[PDB]
Write a protein that binds this ligand. Sequence first.
Ligand code: DUP
Ligand code: DUP
Ligand code: DUP
Ligand code: MG
Ligand code: MG
Ligand code: MG
Lengths: 153, 153, 153
Amino acid sequence: STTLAIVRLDPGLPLPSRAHDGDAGVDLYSAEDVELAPGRRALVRTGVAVAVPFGMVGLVHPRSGLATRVGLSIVNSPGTIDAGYRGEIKVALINLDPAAPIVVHRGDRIAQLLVQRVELVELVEVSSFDEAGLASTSRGDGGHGSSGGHASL
Amino acid sequence: STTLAIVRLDPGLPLPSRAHDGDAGVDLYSAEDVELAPGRRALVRTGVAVAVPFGMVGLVHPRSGLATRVGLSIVNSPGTIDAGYRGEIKVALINLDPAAPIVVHRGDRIAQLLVQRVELVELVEVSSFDEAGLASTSRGDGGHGSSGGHASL
Amino acid sequence: STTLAIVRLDPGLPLPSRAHDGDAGVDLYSAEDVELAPGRRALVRTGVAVAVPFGMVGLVHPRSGLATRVGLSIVNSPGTIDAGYRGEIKVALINLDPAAPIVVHRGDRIAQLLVQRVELVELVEVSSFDEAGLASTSRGDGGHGSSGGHASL
Ligand SMILES: O=c1ccn([C@H]2C[C@H](O)[C@@H](COP(=O)(O)NP(=O)(O)OP(=O)(O)O)O2)c(=O)[nH]1
Ligand SMILES: O=c1ccn([C@H]2C[C@H](O)[C@@H](COP(=O)(O)NP(=O)(O)OP(=O)(O)O)O2)c(=O)[nH]1
Ligand SMILES: O=c1ccn([C@H]2C[C@H](O)[C@@H](COP(=O)(O)NP(=O)(O)OP(=O)(O)O)O2)c(=O)[nH]1
Ligand SMILES: [Mg+2]
Ligand SMILES: [Mg+2]
Ligand SMILES: [Mg+2]
């Protein structure tokens, strides 16, 4: 398996775990009680540090239930935990509900951490994609809604 | 190819497809008409269920055109569809424009689904990264803007 | 290494680089000065175009420091740069702070670009997961907070 070394900076919280076999992420706990008014964010400690392997990345994603039920999100989602980072994972929670505050208690599961390979790319500067001998593509320079699919596009 | 079994829970919608060869995602349709006032979210049915292979994850990402043109986003982006999930994919749309409502019609393309491998990690609890014999890293405990690049950091 | 061809559409900006060895992303610069009032977004040029290899995807993620310090986010995060795209990478910045405007200067590092493999899936339509001979799963149709972990779930 791909092992991930982890330090429970706050040993009072359980180790992050998958809710079900095959789940992509292990759920991260809040070390803290925090209450977010509408529109407010906080930087919340999870009580863990990890050593993402070289060649990989840790990614902090919101949980869907809280997202829908109370509008909880993460400002920098997907949080990007670098392989060299040995500090505490912190989660930038934000309340995107307009009216109802969100109360987080220490020990709630407030996000999930995935680990994936990542390509540590070597940039090759060219003067044009033609010089790199790249074939023309279907997409070309099309983006930002170029394929349609909604009246505003 | 990597096959993805899919059930069209709503057979009136086309199968999700890539807009162009090589595109990362297949676009998901809204099964529903929904109108989001500024700041409001909804949990929108896509009319599909999928079986992400074990060892992989499905990821629901916003489309860029709607993001810019009308401020449409996804509260839990990137939505994390687990390999064991066999329910309907639902998209937590949110209107991040301050003033203009977003109207979604059934059959609009409102998000995109990627599939990637994911490392199903085995946590190894250590008392310190030293005990794991890990070398010191350049980054160390630096994060949350430690490398600079903006006046607020 | 995985090479990524890049055109500096704006040669006055440095090539994107990793802040530290092993970091997942290369930081993207703003080509532009832009000032975002609370709640406003902009579509910001980065001054680069890239050729993500076929079979891969580029992903534009927010930086964590700006996310926490000033509430900067990205409407379509994680931005999905397709392998066929040869246009300029643009970043849909948004100010999620309620009260303080964010000022971006040309040359600030405003996001980071990761490159990952992606599964270009072949959809296989089935009438039920049973027909595909898929085993029942632990998770079943559970989602959107089914595993608990917060009082609102
Ligand atoms: O952050 C981003 C995301 C996308 N893009 C460009 C590159 C990408 O290949 C292209 C299309 O992205 P999406 O598919 O995510 N958006 P949308 O579906 O609205 O556009 P299109 O209809 O062209 O696919 O837009 C950016 O420049 N920055
Ligand atoms: O959700 C997150 C994201 C990042 N981090 C930590 C780990 C990561 O390696 C580190 C830097 O993340 P980013 O590169 O995404 N943010 P930024 O570029 O602002 O910080 P730095 O200048 O240190 O790279 O911050 C977290 O604790 N939680
Ligand atoms: O965008 C999404 C994200 C998740 N889902 C479904 C599929 C996924 O496997 C399931 C659980 O997703 P999360 O783990 O991200 N959310 P949460 O942890 O709140 O739910 P659960 O407690 O069931 O794991 O919800 C969607 O339909 N759309
Ligand atoms: Mg979950
Ligand atoms: Mg698209
Ligand atoms: Mg960084």
